[model samples]
Target: SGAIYVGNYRVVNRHLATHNDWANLVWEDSSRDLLVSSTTAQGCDTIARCDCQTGVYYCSSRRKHYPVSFSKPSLIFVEASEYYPARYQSHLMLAVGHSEPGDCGGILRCQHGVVGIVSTGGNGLVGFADVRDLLWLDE
Candidate 1:
């Protein structure tokens, strides 16, 4: 056909992509994980953001307008093998167990099939559930 630009099937969801004008981050996402773009922006263009896992692309505003920036935007969508340290939590029970590692490195896997990550206060983890099937997520 033509330059059919598309993303990987595993890559899903997206965000506003936090970035600054210093580097027009062309980025992407995979299962909520951000991936960075390999090619840097040219001339005025800076850094483009990407998905951390699958190395997908993330979009922002139109080239003509809406391009914004941050002074020290937190780093997201890192490269593969680079642990972003998104603490993965788990629980253990005789019928079902539980466990959670406090701050160290990122664990990219399903936890408890239904665990809650909270607002630093350990309160956000109230309504947690496992993903039986993403197909029925809308339900």
Candidate 2:
């Protein structure tokens, strides 16, 4: 404990983890972090695919909403009809957010592009929130 010292304690908006291991040591510093939302106007809190830079889930977001609500209609009915034969269930799941590479982000989508498949949080980079509520309740 004595080895660690907080000369000036500062409270940030993000979580900071410090650790030392055999292979390597790492410290997560998110002091001035920029949180991008994965929400959508479609009303789904699940992001199919995103650019994460300015909160753009589809193609790109013209305006940046610090906390964007993801609503991927494509994922809703991507391969429901099974239009592309066996390719019905195929989709794309990304583990990288277009924003800061080091930061965590998500990319959930089906390989079936014809149906507008959605992306899940393979590499999810979720932003902080003041009032959060758009997630679907378990049945």
Candidate 3:
């Protein structure tokens, strides 16, 4: 039931699975031109197509477009807490060694295409929700 707007795009659907620490936002772009060149990743192995450094584009909480880079994978732990009742291991999540607060729901793009979406971040590691698993949502 949470939705956010970025520029002219509206986030219609949001998903957050605390068990896997995976989350994503589905954007509705009426213009259908939001992604002019690149296409979404075809499979979960999309991370494998990324190089050491990949581009991350997202509209920050300030509503400003920011560009960052994901260096490599890292590990994180989501312990059981009041907010999240379940404990989650990092296996199902992909972490980029660089991140900041309020980065959740950001887009991660590799040279191949859009690989994932920002889900969680802490201690300099940012987790992403794989585009492969979400391909059906946006389609």
Candidate 4:
């Protein structure tokens, strides 16, 4: 098997094969990454939305649309500000992250990496590892 290099290899983070015999790609340059948190303060893992206008250290997110069984929060590095559909001003491109079952909230898979939200959907300030809950199995 050979590699078909399209853009900068350093920027490529995620890849996937779609149902239509196509590919989905994500570009994320580590040199430009930042440590952000969800704006809703619901959790510190799910990297869903970000309000750059508020500040670089802020973000927002609810339960991800995938893994429809439970709220599997994961990290996602997306663009700061973008407008595509007009209904939602922040059209973030899937940059990079550690998500299970694939995190495509924008455009369809194998496309330009715009999460296609099936439904419409948060705020506050929360940092990573700010709080840790201790669970005990001795219940």
Encode model 1's per-residue lDDT on 35-92: one tens digit a residue: 2222232222112222111111111111111111111212233223333345422221
Model 3 reaches what TM-score against the true structure? 0.43
Look at candidate 4 and tell me the lDDT of residue 103: 24
RMSD of each: 18.5, 17.1, 10.5, 18.6
TM-score against native, each model: 0.16, 0.15, 0.43, 0.14
List candidate 4 segments past 4 Å from native. 1-13, 17-27, 30-103, 107-139
lDDT of 3 by residue, 1-139 (tens): 1122323223221332222112232332211112111123332322324443556555455455445555344335554534344444332244445555456656666666655556556675666544333333333
- Candidate whose TM-score is highest: 3
Clash totals for all candidate models? 37, 27, 0, 13
Rank ordering of all candidates by TM-score, starting from the highest: 3, 1, 2, 4
Q: Tens digits of per-residue lDDT for model 2 on 2-86? A: 0111111211112222222111322212222212222122222232232222232322222221323433221111222121221
lDDT of 4 by residue, 34-78 (tens): 111112213212122211111111112333222211111234333
Better of 3 and 4 by TM-score: 3
Ranking 1 against 3 by TM-score, winner: 3
Question: In order, what lDDT does every prediction score?
Answer: 0.20, 0.22, 0.41, 0.20
